[PDB]
């Protein structure tokens, strides 16, 4: 937790007072990086850009992705919803 | 296309004279302005990373460079401006 | 092929619940299983139960004040009590 | 992390590239080294190459280069993938009650969704659009 | 180690109330302890089984039994934030100021985990606010070291 | 851990007179009443059992159909195959 | 010996002064909103010539006089090893 | 955008792109998933991508409502965005 | 050596598990970490998968996670093996 | 002005007068404080250096670290540009925030002809930078015996 990191003891002054990490830094949960920010129709989003393994079947892999997501949904925090903004797969099934 | 980059030279002689190690100098510059992956921690049962980095407001401006201090062997705090110089130049952001 | 008798069931921590909360949920399900002796028999964990363990807290402040490095403390504790693989030697022509 | 393009190229890209040899069915090799600190080396093979073997051979050479890489690069994880370059699909995640920020959703996805999608057969590569959380220590030079 | 003594250590740990009830009728040693010196009261307190704490106390359990490192059930209950168990133990004579081998008290432990109501209950039963562990720390030191403002206010 | 998440493996069998598939269905039902965020999955034999059980009907039907088609070819008749197929219980009863 | 140096000092100076440092960015993510400038910080880069290796600084004397690498060694381009020498019909050659 | 451009300016361009689809292609586009900091190039401050999903073919009657005409219009509209390269494109039958 | 189960899980098991991606025909993965200082992670593949390819894909993902493991675990080494094979015989060697 | 900064960098000597004929700020500065003259000096665009000066471009314009166009031309060995800049009154002894002069930069990169021209226009050979080093000190450190003797 941020609290535990905050009380890391950097050093003890000669007058005995403590220098804690929270004294020389702000501690927060935050991204590993801050470069990628996504929106879906203008609202905050995240997502997974998925690429097909060499030679794998697109329709089959898509189904398998769907089945895996289905397992996750019942355990979502409130408000969390999967959306489907970009799929190359439907066109294969549909056009065939 | 090439873009402006901020070139900073560490003066080896000055550093040796003040007794500030080049490792301290480089870790100090790199950690603050670049971020450093220190080690892992556990967040709600999942192992995740710990990053040290300068707070944003201290790594936006070129003059900020001199606000960072390294501790010499004699225990004196030495500002970056004492053992370094800088200039603008052009470089590539993407080499092919 | 293995046992191939009865069923093999996995209870999963799908959120951030943690070990204790997953144990409670396990116990809950095992108790409910036992109320249906007519349909289920010998429903049981395949794993082990928590046991007493000996928690030792190093006091950082007292170590820093005594001039004892953490690495020495922790290496002293683990090498002595846990044992430590230092390096290899050669015993009648075999590396060991 | 924190590397400029030239540092990436001369410290990572060139080292890995010089170890790419005795690989069957290779038609050509290209790479980018950018000031994000990122390098991508792409090896393209003749049609009909077994992609499994191609990957295995590429990694056998890569592991000769690994010890020569900066420790910070090794610790970020180097990866070797066999995928199409284009996206099969994008799975988006939102919060309809608006009770989670972009950062929040991204951590959730990374921490709860992304690994199992990554292990799914046929999934060559997964890009997270966002970042997993890290413990962020934001230092103050004045206080330091 | 007793046959029923062992059965009781397990039932209390598991919070199998009805089993504990039967075990009490049958005379299962309430002072049974495992290898690390824990009693059923220790176990019930740790895992927060309130009724079993009450049943054990009605049946002559040592309220102030200490384990091999000198910790009591009040230590455990305070530490893991079981407020009602804390209250019950105190009403039944738990030493509010019990020190373990480390000089750690129930107040120390409750403050360290930020358990305000339990800290209040303990102060109410006469917890020595100035008690120091083996390192000279008070519950107050813990509070400000943890950066817990509410807790600090409580301990003045 | 199971599929990257904290997990607990549970073994059991169907009570005498009951099928494991029935015993599984109950386990699924008790599982659905566990605290929020606790999920489950079938592995090992149960994994094999499930996907194996979903074939059987299709395979038995294919067998039935092909036997009939062969016999109809043999006898040049859609009905005479029935007089052969009727013998199946005659041997199966002895086995049982 | 004359300058009281060893190959260990020589190796240290080369590691320190023939470095390629990751040094971060001005205005990198996450920024202070409003930032106009984003630029790479460029610090030490690899040496490229015998001249640069020669003026590597090993130490300054009590006297202020400098000891450079060229003062204790010859610097030149030469083979990683000198074990293989080929001739084509008696003439100096190389080959694959 | 040109290298040197901030994440903030890249967001501004992304908004113009998202805007165009949400207002001028109401009849044709179902959703926009826009990403700041990711492009085919690489995780930069100066790059982004928009994934567009269209309404079903049945609701996009006529050549003016097919992807080729939509992407031409879009690319022409975006041609007037300053100091950025922005263009819509249909991915070819086979990329490769 | 000398590690408790939580130590093993949180510095070895989770790191390895998080790197088990891009491997083909995986059905499921399971692991346990215990206080003898030991972890085992079993990956089970679809029937018909080439066991050699499966192993080399697993070991190559592992090979790239090694730098993320603690030193002493790297020292001991981490083995990848086909485990679904059984014993032909067991030869006991005793001293009487 | 932004178009001129860009035209200057590209060496598009034609586009440069077209914009200045439309009155673009000749001393327009970019985010690091480089003017069109800074950029022409850097990428060796003589024609544009010449046209810029004749249209009143500040010959002694400095960037956000105190570096001038003469610093850039001298550092990168653009002899002609160095001459042109000096003729139009460039501060031959200009110091950047580090106390580094054109002479320092020319010396460091062994630009012998450039050093001579700088000296001709009266560059101060005794000039020290923030570390007390002169052009001479640099020549000795670099092992440039040719240059080291010229600094006598």
Numbering used by the authors:
A (entry chain A): 242 to 337
B (entry chain A): 722 to 817
C (entry chain B): 674 to 769
D (entry chain A): 50 to 193
E (entry chain D): 11 to 166
F (entry chain B): 818 to 913
G (entry chain C): 194 to 289
H (entry chain A): 578 to 673
Paper quotes:
The AcrA-AcrB-TolC complex is a secondary active antiport system in Escherichia coli, powered by the electrochemical proton gradient across the inner membrane of this Gram-negative bacterium. Its biological function is to capture cytotoxic compounds from either the periplasmic space or the inner membrane, and to expel them across the outer membrane, into the extracellular medium. AcrB is the inner-membrane component of the system, and is responsible for both substrate recognition and energy transduction. The asymmetric trimer structures indicate that this domain also cycles between three distinct conformations, and point to several ionizable residues in its core (D407, D408, K940 and R971) that might function as a proton-relay network.
